[PDB]
Scaffold this active site. Structure first.
Site, PDB file in Angstrom:
ATOM      1  N   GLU A  72      -9.227 -11.839  -0.119  1.00 54.32           N
ATOM      2  CA  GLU A  72      -9.953 -12.723   0.077  1.00 54.32           C
ATOM      3  C   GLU A  72      -9.171 -14.123   0.089  1.00 54.32           C
ATOM      4  O   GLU A  72      -9.623 -14.949   0.788  1.00 54.32           O
ATOM      5  CB  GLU A  72     -10.895 -12.982  -1.191  1.00 54.32           C
ATOM      6  CG  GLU A  72     -11.458 -11.762  -1.773  1.00 54.32           C
ATOM      7  CD  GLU A  72     -12.627 -11.010  -0.863  1.00 54.32           C
ATOM      8  OE1 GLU A  72     -12.413 -11.094   0.419  1.00 54.32           O
ATOM      9  OE2 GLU A  72     -13.630 -10.201  -1.420  1.00 54.32           O
ATOM     10  N   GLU A 121     -14.554  -6.132   4.024  1.00 50.64           N
ATOM     11  CA  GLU A 121     -15.597  -6.640   3.020  1.00 50.64           C
ATOM     12  C   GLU A 121     -16.573  -5.466   2.792  1.00 50.64           C
ATOM     13  O   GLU A 121     -16.903  -5.361   1.305  1.00 50.64           O
ATOM     14  CB  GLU A 121     -16.443  -7.817   3.824  1.00 50.64           C
ATOM     15  CG  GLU A 121     -15.631  -8.973   4.048  1.00 50.64           C
ATOM     16  CD  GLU A 121     -14.865  -9.792   2.995  1.00 50.64           C
ATOM     17  OE1 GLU A 121     -14.243  -9.048   2.110  1.00 50.64           O
ATOM     18  OE2 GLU A 121     -14.618 -10.992   3.354  1.00 50.64           O
ATOM     19  N   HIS A 179     -14.135  -3.225   0.077  1.00 51.73           N
ATOM     20  CA  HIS A 179     -14.216  -4.278  -1.113  1.00 51.73           C
ATOM     21  C   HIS A 179     -15.576  -3.833  -1.721  1.00 51.73           C
ATOM     22  O   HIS A 179     -15.602  -3.436  -2.886  1.00 51.73           O
ATOM     23  CB  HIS A 179     -14.396  -5.532  -0.952  1.00 51.73           C
ATOM     24  CG  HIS A 179     -13.227  -6.247  -0.208  1.00 51.73           C
ATOM     25  ND1 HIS A 179     -12.857  -7.474   0.193  1.00 51.73           N
ATOM     26  CD2 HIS A 179     -11.861  -5.343  -0.068  1.00 51.73           C
ATOM     27  CE1 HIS A 179     -11.337  -7.683   0.432  1.00 51.73           C
ATOM     28  NE2 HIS A 179     -10.993  -6.255   0.382  1.00 51.73           N
ATOM     29  N   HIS A 211      -8.280 -14.204   3.797  1.00 49.77           N
ATOM     30  CA  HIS A 211      -9.564 -14.307   4.419  1.00 49.77           C
ATOM     31  C   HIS A 211      -9.849 -15.955   4.475  1.00 49.77           C
ATOM     32  O   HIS A 211     -10.388 -16.572   5.390  1.00 49.77           O
ATOM     33  CB  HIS A 211     -10.627 -13.775   4.128  1.00 49.77           C
ATOM     34  CG  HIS A 211     -10.456 -12.247   4.025  1.00 49.77           C
ATOM     35  ND1 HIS A 211     -11.310 -11.145   3.446  1.00 49.77           N
ATOM     36  CD2 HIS A 211      -9.300 -11.405   4.510  1.00 49.77           C
ATOM     37  CE1 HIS A 211     -10.805  -9.980   3.999  1.00 49.77           C
ATOM     38  NE2 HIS A 211      -9.922 -10.076   4.507  1.00 49.77           N
ATOM     39  N   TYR A 221     -16.347  -1.331  -5.793  1.00 49.44           N
ATOM     40  CA  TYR A 221     -17.088  -1.709  -7.099  1.00 49.44           C
ATOM     41  C   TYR A 221     -17.914  -0.567  -7.398  1.00 49.44           C
ATOM     42  O   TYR A 221     -17.912  -0.277  -8.563  1.00 49.44           O
ATOM     43  CB  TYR A 221     -17.974  -2.843  -7.048  1.00 49.44           C
ATOM     44  CG  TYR A 221     -16.880  -4.175  -6.450  1.00 49.44           C
ATOM     45  CD1 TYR A 221     -16.159  -4.662  -7.237  1.00 49.44           C
ATOM     46  CD2 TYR A 221     -17.660  -4.931  -5.212  1.00 49.44           C
ATOM     47  CE1 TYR A 221     -15.464  -5.866  -6.815  1.00 49.44           C
ATOM     48  CE2 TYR A 221     -16.806  -5.928  -4.705  1.00 49.44           C
ATOM     49  CZ  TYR A 221     -15.942  -6.717  -5.514  1.00 49.44           C
ATOM     50  OH  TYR A 221     -15.214  -7.678  -5.114  1.00 49.44           O
ATOM     51  N   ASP A 281     -19.887  -9.466  -1.313  1.00 47.09           N
ATOM     52  CA  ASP A 281     -19.114  -8.654  -0.210  1.00 47.09           C
ATOM     53  C   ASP A 281     -20.050  -7.927   0.795  1.00 47.09           C
ATOM     54  O   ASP A 281     -19.572  -7.683   1.798  1.00 47.09           O
ATOM     55  CB  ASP A 281     -18.092  -7.729  -0.876  1.00 47.09           C
ATOM     56  CG  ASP A 281     -16.648  -8.349  -1.125  1.00 47.09           C
ATOM     57  OD1 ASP A 281     -16.169  -8.987  -0.132  1.00 47.09           O
ATOM     58  OD2 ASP A 281     -16.146  -8.096  -2.120  1.00 47.09           O
ATOM     59  N   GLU A 332     -15.274 -17.181   0.014  1.00 49.71           N
ATOM     60  CA  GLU A 332     -14.049 -16.477  -0.237  1.00 49.71           C
ATOM     61  C   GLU A 332     -13.342 -17.102  -1.335  1.00 49.71           C
ATOM     62  O   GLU A 332     -12.581 -16.132  -2.069  1.00 49.71           O
ATOM     63  CB  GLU A 332     -13.207 -16.577   1.204  1.00 49.71           C
ATOM     64  CG  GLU A 332     -13.852 -15.916   2.351  1.00 49.71           C
ATOM     65  CD  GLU A 332     -13.590 -14.338   2.098  1.00 49.71           C
ATOM     66  OE1 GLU A 332     -13.009 -13.688   1.296  1.00 49.71           O
ATOM     67  OE2 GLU A 332     -13.938 -13.592   3.267  1.00 49.71           O
TER      68      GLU A 332
END
Ligand SMILES: [Mg+2]
Ligand SMILES: [Mg+2]
Ligand SMILES: [Mn+2]
Ligand SMILES: [Mn+2]
Ligand SMILES: [Mn+2]
Ligand SMILES: [Mn+2]
Lengths: 683, 86, 289, 289, 683
Positions: free
Chosen positions: C183, C82, C86, C186, C90, C51, C149
């Site tokens: 994703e 991204e 995303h 995407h 994390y 990402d 993706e």
């Protein structure tokens, strides 16, 4: 989940396409079979109960000492002989969660409904066993309900004051502002809602001791008051509630209003301070003609004329203010200000609207003062005189600060018992007793006005409930006819009781001779217009009760002329928030918001249908939001023509209608003679 | 020929010049004397020579100031500065 | 025929990790074995890397070369998701579950892991090889992006989904499902752009582009197998994950308008279970009644 | 020291065009004179055209050359707002107020306009001159970007704010205020990135970069004065607009860590109405002397 | 840019590697030959000037009416005979921007430095022409400087109050809290900084009449006071400044400190109210021994013992509080609390630290009361008795609220003129006059304490300037020897003047008989220890002046025993922020922050070099941040041993040092006898 809660939630479960309303009754039984009786402290006899409550500082010794124990036992027996049963679960739940006396550990119930009613009756009677029994019969028939302060605290040692509506006048000085903050804190400590008039305060950018652009305006005072009300929050039990009223011709009116905008900064917005706007007829005339209005700096007006801006009639003073070069003002658009008021009411329900001329064209005590502002609930409308709180070691000039005594008639119970006269007179006597027994040692003007004016507020509730259980739509002309007749009788018997008390005690309220009661002007519309019902259905509703005619009103006018009137103010219709639950009644004279209301207590859900709701009267229990607000305004004006003070009038709006509709409702209320508008609740 | 260093214990640049003066004494200490004076303890001398910042390096020859250098200097620049007066 | 509906779908899917409170996973995390926690951290770290590069490089560079303000707006929005949404999510998960030293160690581990470096080298190399006005280099990078993706993320997605499906780590799992939902759209969108370019070619050129796509897929696949074994052998799941990545490889090919390449297999059913008011002015007639 | 804080402020300011209903503007638009409608259209097209350059080139080019994952994410978010939110918002305002043929003609006019073109091409020229691994050229582009975000937009913003402060075109004025609030933070953020580069330079190089910034400001300012008279003389506002330009030029300079260039002036009130030390534990024996 | 601005900026343009300090002088000339002389208002003679200032409500006519115009003319001629010249541009700029009297529109200058000094002297003398000339010579020589309130407002009609700081004791009651808010607003309106002791207020979670967990603690009162100070902000000119002081043993001490944390929520954060912490020796002892401490609930202690927690000695009652089950307390880590104090002071410079035992071990009026808190600048340390503000219509028990008048000796000018005795006595007389003519009609405890205590504050400025201009390092033992001798002389002559005033008026301060002055204990260290300089350089500095010996101190002790003392408190060293510019002096006895300070005024920037800064004394003017804080603590303790009140001791810290270094400095200050610590300013 407790059994009574399941039985209550079974209401929404539809059987044969109908709500199981009767199941609610079963819930009450469960709520008493499983919970109330188990957690109710029982004594071998009433003597032991009274001794335990007095010794453990639950009750007061003074009011119980006025009776022999035999008389107290007889009053309690009269209360228990009714065998009163709560018809809905929410009534008993609200009473035993809010009003029933509990132990210090809050796990046991010391007072039943009959015990609380007997104690309040004994407190009311002040030593008269027969009067106490009359009060017990009045409250156990649920014809009259003392307000939440009176009902909760009467006869209790650990209690707040029995008055919770206080109106303060703030003079334009730092000493007066600090004293207003102190008095607001002291009255919030007592548990009362405090309303402060900020119109006399000079606006932002005014001079202090001839230095320019020095005043912070009314917004700084509002911040101080908001902090004071946050601090004084009933010993950390309820959120401190205060109201601030500003005249719409005050210069700060925009910034005032800006305190309620969501976009306002932290140094501008006040969160625990309600706001109300006083709108004289001059502002409405300026908006109607689209002429640009002027907001005036109060201190310049005071310097030029020697009187405060809110102390003179703006209708005759506005042109002189505008044409006076020594009076400072700014140009505003009154229609833009009205649209701002409507937008703010749509966003948050604020401000309260006070139509000054609507209040003062029927005000009986304009000689004492014109009504400049209202209370936190926007229904108390009384004459007030500002106080001059000077420096230390200097005598203050104590004025009049409004504090009226609340109590509500249950229209359904009163009319089904055919006891309008007796209930009104007994409620007036109880309100007089509570006003006489109120002594506030930290609010000098409040205490002085309570001693002098002797003003009480006798309200009514269950109007929509009574109309719906009698097959009458709230918006129907028959409903307005009934309201007209019923509240004319209420006014007649309230005036009669006030005059009787004045004759018995030999004293009237201070400055009564200048009132319209003394001159007989108040009775004009009563000695010329007959208020008997115009519909046969309403007349049959009033069957068995004598409806005062024009001759009766003439006799009452002569009686008032001969003997005077004890109370400066008698009737005001309060919202009646939680006492309407205990009385199984609809709140105030407002239409019902919902037919069945869903509430969340703890982690449990509960369902309260409106009193007497069934399949037959489901259509007559129309929700307030679905109603035409013009007809609600018409009904409230019909009631207001018989109420000396105001009525807590909440607007009920749909999300679809715009601010133009809100402004139209406000202007129709002004046209129809509505004195105050309380809230704009959007569904 | 004397290289006088006007310094203080709180002066960061004066701490950086200290090892440079030790290397200079090892390479040139037969022809050059290096003198350090703390301006926090010896304000009269710092005032006499008009020092108003540190490190200030004075090249003295036979008691007279012949060159003045202000701020940090690398070894090679100090050698060039002193070698003009040897 | 499609950009506007993708624009609307992308913007209506907008979210931030802070919308999901993560302290609820604290206990189910504490209860996992050391092997399970290690694999989980590393899996999410591998996703973070992908990402990071998709947001920093892949999506912006494709946006630069694709014509049309609306197409560029969609690609710019996807790029923001991204790296701003995303990749950051994390870290929200890491900061909740793990002490700083374990977080530091896993980011050091991504830098030195040969399979993760190889896959980044290959994908980013293709992004940086795009030549202005050269549609073939652009197609190749779009194939690489679809493979990132719709294929490469899935060796990572397996494990959060595997736990979610057992009622474990469900808050972290909710974040991962939102990422996966993004994703998927995407991969479809970039796939449609790639097909546009492919459809302009001669039959001979198309044949070469299919060769490129299949050769690239196989090369990435072989590397992903080794990566999968390296991560999952310690938790006993490598064979199961391999079936999952083959399943998703077929979806990537389909997003590119190509036939499935791997035979269908039964995926772990646990993982399948893991899947202001209006204002009007006042008229002069509103003041009269 | 600042990127995570700006990340937070940026994402919490997220908004979409659809949130503001535009149709109610037609109730005040119909009451404006031809010159007022003409100026508004021209100003709006000016803002639209400049903001498109920022979305397609300005923000993405800076994101490309700036090092740091978190900075790239914030910059991506800002680029997204330009392309996905601002551009759609300007289009929506236009489509509400003018018919298709009128929009096409206004854009044709503003596209040919000498003063709009001069500033648009000056800014774009500096973005095109950025060289890989050359922080001086990056700084110059950042200065150009800050001048656009914090200065050049404001000769345009003046008019919608002027109406907004009077109760006219309130829906489009609300939209413009949200856009302006985004450009303000964009300008501050890019300004901090420019100061970071500036602070890495020698004293001679700093003086040279200051001269660059002031020279550029002067060129843009003299063209803004001409742009202003060209648009605002017909509605009698140019004097007050000029005060607003200088006030915003000073803000742009302060964003770049430079002193204000222009003397302080009051602004039109209608437009105004529209607008840790290291913790070390006590070790004992610190109580004894 | 103005010519004088360019000349002042020419200082930093180095010529031959040296700063152009002399250019500063040129600037002043420009500032007078281009701005001051053109903007000044000249009259035909002094009579027209005085008449214009009197009729136009610039001057009070009462103080001028005590002199014939010939005497006023003689006083003004004495002021102008000195031909006083400002040696630096910033001195004249600060006087003519902050203290020179201007017109109503502030377009012209009505008062020169000599005019202001003459008016202040005439106000001080109260009808004595010779005394007025003595004051004129004292101020034009710049030996003594009245505080900013006194210097700015003396003899002005539009003046505020001449008292700089006020200290209020807040009792634990809603009435007392509201009265404290009112008095704080009134005194901020008068322009003075208000300090309030919140240690008597009960902590959060205490009972208000048997309902528990009801109090908001000191944080709610803090928010109320913060809003009050925000509202009363000197008519919008100077931001309202308040201080709250809490004992470190109060349970709310953490929440108190949390008001200054940069991460605090808006409902807790307080931004316009400075915070101070009073630390008894017991807390330092507990932290030293690492034994977990206990913070206490004040209301439980008051209920159990009948006295407030801060009303008695914690060093002897802490164990009784801990072992008493009827006292409520919470466990804390005293070392963690000290680290929190250090972190807070590093982040924001708060709280002020008051070492209570250090104050009260040498406090001369412990019989009246112990010093429980300090002022906004943490240098006033006086006995205070809390007031019992009761309900309305009830008499209030008025206590003692601290208030003293500030005045600073210019050490350089006093020692250059060899006039320690004369300057000290004249300053004491001026401060006594300021106290006598101070009458505050809205602060009763402040008025009573001013009338009874008769407390004054005689400070000192230009300690570092004198030391650097005489070649003495501020950290050197010679500087501490000079401070010891000079301030012993100041204390001796202040006590002598106080006793002489008591003799001439036949009255002492209230409760003087129980003080250590009456018993002779105060003079113990003065009748056994010799404070003559131990270094030859300091003795030469004191040449031409009779340094009091033990025999002179014994004679003074006998004189005090025979006649008493007029002032309860005489010496307090205020920060002297902006008036130090006019006197061309370093601020207070603190070391200089910087050698040349760059200050931005308008759109221009100016550089003020320290007074007397040059090449020969550059490194003698060592910056405070570069100094060892331990030696600064040693200097402040050496001065403090001769000062009855406190000294505003600002700590000057480097960014590199940790909170442990700050804690070490605080503990060394406590060990060395430092009474209060003002600020932790980090470079
Ligand atoms: Mg006044
Ligand atoms: Mg009390
Ligand atoms: Mn992604
Ligand atoms: Mn993606
Ligand atoms: Mn934009
Ligand atoms: Mn932008």
């Amino acid at each position: 989940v407790p059994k009574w809660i399941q039985l209550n939630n079974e209401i929404m479960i539809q059987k044969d396409g109908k709500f199981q309303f009767d199941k609610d009754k079963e819930a009450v039984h469960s709520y008493f079979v499983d919970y109330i009786n188990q957690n109710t402290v029982f004594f071998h006899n009433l003597k032991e109960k009274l001794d335990y409550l007095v010794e453990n500082q639950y009750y007061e010794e003074e009011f119980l000492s006025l009776y022999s124990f035999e008389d107290i036992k007889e009053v309690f027996k009269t209360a228990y002989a009714k065998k009163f049963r709560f018809p809905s679960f929410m009534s008993a739940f609200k009473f035993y969660n809010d009003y029933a006396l509990k132990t210090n550990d809050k796990k046991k119930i010391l007072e039943r409904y009959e015990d609380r009613i007997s104690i309040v009756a004994l407190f009311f009677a002040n030593g008269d066993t027969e009067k106490a029994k009359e009060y017990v019969n009045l409250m156990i028939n649920q014809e009259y309900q003392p307000s939440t302060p009176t009902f909760l605290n009467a006869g209790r040692k650990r209690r707040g004051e029995l008055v919770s509506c206080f109106l303060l006048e703030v003079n334009d000085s730092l000493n007066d502002i600090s004293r207003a903050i102190d008095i607001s804190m002291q009255l919030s400590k007592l548990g009362g809602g405090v309303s402060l008039n900020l119109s006399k305060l000079r606006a932002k950018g005014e001079a202090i001791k001839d230095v320019e652009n020095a005043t912070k305006g009314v917004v700084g005072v509002m911040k101080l008051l908001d902090n004071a009300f946050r601090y004084a929050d009933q010993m950390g039990q309820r959120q401190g509630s205060g109201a601030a009223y500003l005249n719409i011709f005050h210069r700060d009116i925009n910034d005032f209003l800006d305190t309620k905008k969501i976009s306002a900064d932290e140094d501008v917005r006040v969160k625990t301070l309600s706001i109300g706007v006083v709108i004289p007829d001059k502002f409405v005339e300026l908006a109607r003609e689209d002429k640009a209005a002027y907001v005036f700096y109060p201190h310049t007006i005071y310097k030029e004329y020697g009187q405060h801006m809110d102390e003179m009639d703006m209708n005759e003073m506005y042109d002189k203010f505008v044409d006076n070069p020594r009076v400072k003002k700014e140009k505003i658009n009154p229609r833009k200000l009205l649209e701002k008021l409507a937008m703010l009411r749509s966003e948050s329900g604020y401000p309260y609207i006070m139509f000054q001329d609507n209040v003062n064209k029927v005000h009986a005590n304009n000689h004492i003062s014109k009504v400049k502002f209202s209370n936190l609930c926007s229904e108390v409308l009384q004459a007030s005189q500002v106080s001059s709180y000077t420096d230390y070691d200097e005598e203050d000039e104590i004025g009049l600060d409004i504090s009226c005594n609340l109590g509500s008639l249950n229209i359904l119970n009163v009319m089904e018992h055919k006891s309008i006269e007796k209930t009104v007179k007994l409620a007036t006597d109880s309100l007089t007793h509570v006003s006489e027994t109120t002594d506030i040692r930290n609010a000098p003007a409040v205490r002085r006005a309570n001693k002098a004016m002797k003003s009480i507020g006798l309200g009514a509730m269950n109007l929509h409930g009574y109309l719906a259980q009698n097959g009458i739509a709230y918006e129907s002309p028959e409903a307005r006819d009934f309201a007209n007749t019923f509240f004319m009788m209420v006014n007649f018997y309230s005036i009669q009781r006030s005059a009787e008390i004045a004759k018995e005690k030999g004293e009237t309220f201070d400055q009564y001779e200048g009132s319209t009661y003394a001159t007989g002007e108040y009775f004009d519309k009563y000695v010329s217009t007959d208020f008997s019902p115009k519909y046969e259905k309403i007349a049959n509703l009033f069957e068995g009760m004598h409806i005062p005619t024009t001759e009766d009103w003439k006799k009452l006018k002569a009686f008032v002329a001969e003997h005077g009137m004890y109370h400066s103010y008698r009737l005001c219709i309060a919202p009646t928030g939680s006492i309407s639950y205990v009385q199984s009644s609809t709140a105030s004279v407002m239409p019902i918001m919902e037919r069945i209301e869903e509430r969340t207590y703890g982690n449990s859900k509960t369902y309260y249908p409106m009193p007497g709701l069934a399949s037959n009267n489901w259509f007559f229990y129309k929700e307030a939001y679905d109603m035409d607000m013009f007809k609600v305004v018409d009904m409230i004006a019909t009631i207001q023509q018989h109420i000396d003070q105001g009525i807590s009038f909440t607007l009920f709006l749909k999300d679809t209608m715009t601010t133009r509709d809100l402004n139209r409702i406000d202007l129709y209320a002004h046209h129809r003679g509505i004195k105050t508008i309380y809230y704009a609740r959007t569904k | 020929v004397v290289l006088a260093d006007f310094w203080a214990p709180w002066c960061g640049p004066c701490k950086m010049i200290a090892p440079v003066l030790e290397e200079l004494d090892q390479e040139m200490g037969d022809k050059l004397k290096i003198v350090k004076i703390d301006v926090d303890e010896n304000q009269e001398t710092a005032g006499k020579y008009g020092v108003m910042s540190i490190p200030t390096l004075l090249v003295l020859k036979d008691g007279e100031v012949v060159e003045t250098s202000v701020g940090f200097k690398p070894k090679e620049a100090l050698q060039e500065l002193v070698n003009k007066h040897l | 025929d499609f950009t506007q509906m993708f624009y609307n779908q992308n913007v209506k899917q907008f979210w931030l990790p802070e919308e999901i409170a993560l302290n609820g996973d604290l206990l189910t995390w504490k209860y996992l074995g050391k092997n399970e926690q290690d694999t989980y951290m590393k899996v999410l770290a591998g996703l973070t890397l992908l990402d990071t590069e998709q947001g920093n490089t892949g999506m912006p560079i494709v946006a630069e070369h694709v014509d049309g303000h609306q197409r560029k707006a969609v690609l710019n929005f996807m790029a923001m998701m991204e790296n701003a949404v995303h990749a950051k999510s994390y870290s929200n998960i890491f900061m909740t579950l793990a002490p700083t030293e374990t977080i530091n160690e896993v980011f050091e581990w991504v830098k030195q892991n040969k399979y993760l470096q190889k896959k980044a080298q290959m994908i980013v190399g293709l992004y940086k090889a795009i030549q202005k006005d050269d549609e073939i280099s652009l197609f190749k990078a779009m194939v690489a992006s679809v493979y990132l993706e719709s294929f490469l993320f899935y060796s990572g997605f397996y494990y959060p989904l595997y736990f979610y499906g057992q009622g474990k780590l469900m808050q972290s799992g909710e974040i991962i499902n939102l990422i996966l939902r993004d994703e998927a759209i995407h991969g479809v969108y970039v796939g449609l752009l790639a097909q546009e370019i492919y459809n302009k070619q001669t039959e001979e050129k198309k044949a070469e582009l299919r060769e490129f796509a299949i050769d690239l897929l196989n090369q990435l696949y072989e590397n992903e197998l080794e990566y999968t074994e390296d991560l999952y052998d310690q938790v006993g799941l490598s064979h199961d994950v391999k079936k999952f990545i083959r399943y998703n490889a077929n979806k990537a090919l389909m997003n590119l308008g190509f036939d499935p390449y791997f035979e269908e297999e039964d995926i772990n059913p646990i993982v399948l279970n893991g899947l202001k008011a209006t204002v009007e002015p006042l008229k002069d007639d509103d003041f009269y009644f």
